[PDB]
Design a protein around this ligand. Structure first.
Ligand SMILES: [Mg+2]
Ligand SMILES: [Mg+2]
Ligand SMILES: [Mg+2]
Ligand SMILES: [Mg+2]
Ligand SMILES: [Mg+2]
Ligand SMILES: [Mg+2]
Ligand SMILES: [Mg+2]
Ligand SMILES: [Mg+2]
Ligand SMILES: [Mg+2]
Ligand SMILES: [Mg+2]
Ligand SMILES: [Mg+2]
Ligand SMILES: [Mg+2]
Ligand SMILES: [Mg+2]
Ligand SMILES: [Mg+2]
Ligand SMILES: [Mg+2]
Lengths: 38, 136, 131, 141, 92
RNA sequence: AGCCAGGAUGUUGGCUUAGAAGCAGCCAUCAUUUAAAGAAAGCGUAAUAGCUCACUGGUCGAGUCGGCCUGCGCGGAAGA
């Protein structure tokens, strides 16, 4: 995953979740869109 | 890169960027990028933010630039002591108070306008907002 | 979806068709094809024109709000998908059988062809019509 | 009638017998041979016209050959000899390319009625007229 | 196009800002041979009113002390950057 | 919101004949059958096919996607 300070919803299947304080963007279609932080 | 074609004086005082802006209403175009924050925009930043707009909306549409530099900023070279004269003019800046309309746009959709102004707003140091031309 | 006026217009339009109608027929494409669309509705053109509104909206309270005013027996038909194919020219026309005949001609299923209301009857394939 | 087994609508100008660069691998993708679209292909084509693209159903089975029923040539290829300009589209709204009236397209509309689907003739008339709207040919009604 | 509006008693910089920081804003009604009338009114209404294009053209009837005064919005002061009104000049 | 449904015959449409075929780029952005369908928002193809979504149906059936105005927070946030 990426750890950029400005995570955002790249594709349609991307989904924002707040796990353990950290904001993460989990995705079904492309694992490339998986990203943490920010 | 925007700059005054000839001026009275080469070097100008620092001054104080205070008060509210005057170019507040959207005059020419339908939409506009208003400056929320206080600051000063360089000649490069304006060009960079213009390029980001003009390329987003393509050949279509019409853009204005309500702000212009006309304030030379001096800078002292590296490894130079204090005094021994005012420094040389490096770049040119426009002082931006809150409320000042920076850019104005016309002949495009409202949906595609906001996205074009985001790309410009990203280039600029000052915090900005979208404003529409209200009739009186 | 649009406002209560736009929804009311559609039903009040359907109620006026029952006033100047007679026979009807169900149809449920639980695996339709648009090549089928233009047979059962192509037929309606071969009858005469556009007027034959199949109006497939039998929802428990949508076309069944117009039921209380016109033909109360069709409330029980509500369960499972149904299309109220209202007719106009010719009393008891040939549009009833054609849904059952098309069902065999590549349409998977057709609501178990239960029928609507002329003698207040149920699931009956009836060739006995005026021709 | 059977569902989707392996039928596809695909071939260039029906006069072009046995196309290898235009189609080639597609019609010979399945167990059907390359020779089948040459002898049997020009059997029905020579009745109507050559130098004209026309489609056909390719319902392939496990026997060897396939059953088929031809349909009808499409809108704008017919609107070349009928329309006038060989080029169709380019910049219609910015620059009107050509123009056609209702009288021609209404008359041309009904000739395909064996394949065409609708109620009245006037119904498919504004469709097969309409096909002109979308070639930079704003219909002269 | 009808708004209830109170009459002003305190007027200046201190009063106006206190007012503006209370979901309201100052306006004024003037025209004809009569004297001008300084008019306090609510913000959240008039903010929603100005969205319609009729506001800056048609006649508005402002309700003050029972009496309904017929006016047109001549001039208006926007807040520099925030989307909110500071003041309205109602010509009679 | 979910859930078995439908979501077209010509469109290999002209185009630079190597193809653009609802979806590289051109623009048009048909109108019929009609509960509905843009000659199409995305995926997938040498291009097709094909799968989705717009929409429309029927089931369970009640409150619900979104934008400013703000009160406090969250990440951004590594040194001997
Ligand atoms: Mg980091
Ligand atoms: Mg990194
Ligand atoms: Mg953990
Ligand atoms: Mg100059
Ligand atoms: Mg001073
Ligand atoms: Mg000044
Ligand atoms: Mg001025
Ligand atoms: Mg005084
Ligand atoms: Mg003070
Ligand atoms: Mg006077
Ligand atoms: Mg805070
Ligand atoms: Mg830290
Ligand atoms: Mg740090
Ligand atoms: Mg660090
Ligand atoms: Mg660390």
């Amino acid at each position: 995953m990426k750890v950029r300070a400005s995570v955002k919803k790249l594709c349609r299947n991307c989904k924002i979740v707040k796990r353990d304080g950290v904001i993460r963007v989990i995705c079904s279609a492309e694992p490339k869109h998986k990203q943490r932080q920010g | 890169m925007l700059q005054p074609k000839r001026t009275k004086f080469r070097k100008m005082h620092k001054g104080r960027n205070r008060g509210l802006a005057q170019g507040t209403d959207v005059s020419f175009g339908s939409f506009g990028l208003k400056a929320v924050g206080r600051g000063r925009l360089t000649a490069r930043q304006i060009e960079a933010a213009r390029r980001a707009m003009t390329r987003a909306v393509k050949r279509q549409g019409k853009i204005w630039i309500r702000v212009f530099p006309d304030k030379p900023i001096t800078e002292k070279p590296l490894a130079v002591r204090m005094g021994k004269g005012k420094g040389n003019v490096e770049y040119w800046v426009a002082l931006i108070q809150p409320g000042k309309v920076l850019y104005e746009m016309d002949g495009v959709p409202e949906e595609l306008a906001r996205e074009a102004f985001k790309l410009a707003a990203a280039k600029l140091p000052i915090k900005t907002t979208f404003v529409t031309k209200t009739v009186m | 979806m649009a406002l209560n006026l736009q929804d009311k217009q559609a039903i009040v339009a359907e109620v006026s068709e029952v006033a100047k109608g007679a026979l009807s027929a169900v149809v449920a494409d639980s695996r339709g094809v648009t090549v089928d669309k233009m047979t059962e509705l192509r037929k309606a053109g071969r009858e005469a024109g556009v007027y034959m509104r199949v109006v497939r909206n039998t929802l428990l309270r949508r076309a069944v709000e117009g039921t209380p005013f016109e033909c109360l027996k069709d409330a029980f038909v509500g369960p499972t998908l149904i299309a109220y194919s209202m007719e106009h020219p010719g009393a008891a026309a040939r549009l009833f059988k054609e849904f059952a005949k098309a069902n065999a001609k590549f349409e998977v299923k057709a609501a178990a062809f239960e029928g609507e209301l002329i003698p207040a009857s149920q699931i009956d394939r009836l060739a006995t019509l005026p021709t | 009638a059977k569902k989707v087994q392996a039928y596809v609508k695909l071939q260039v100008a029906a006069g072009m017998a046995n196309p290898s660069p235009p189609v080639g691998p597609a019609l010979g993708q399945q167990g059907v041979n390359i020779m089948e679209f040459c002898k049997a292909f020009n059997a029905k084509t020579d009745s109507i016209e050559k130098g004209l693209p026309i489609p056909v159903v390719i319902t392939v089975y496990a026997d060897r050959s396939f059953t088929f029923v031809t349909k009808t040539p499409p809108a704008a290829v017919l609107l070349k000899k009928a329309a006038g300009i060989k080029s169709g589209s380019g910049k219609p709204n910015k620059d009107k390319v050509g123009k056609i009236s209702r009288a021609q397209l209404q008359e041309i509309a009904q000739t395909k009625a064996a394949d065409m689907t609708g109620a009245d003739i006037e119904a498919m008339t504004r469709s097969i007229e309409g096909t002109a709207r979308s070639m930079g040919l704003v219909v002269e009604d | 196009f009808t708004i209830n509006a109170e009459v002003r008693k305190e007027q200046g910089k201190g009063a106006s800002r206190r007012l503006r920081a209370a979901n309201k804003f100052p306006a004024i009604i003037y025209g004809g041979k009569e004297a001008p009338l300084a008019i306090e009114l609510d913000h959240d209404k008039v903010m929603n009113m100005q969205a319609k294009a009729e506001f800056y053209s048609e006649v508005l009837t402002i309700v003050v002390d029972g009496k309904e005064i017929k006016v047109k919005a001549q001039d208006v002061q926007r807040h520099p950057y925030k989307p909110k009104l500071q003041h309205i000049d109602f010509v009679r």
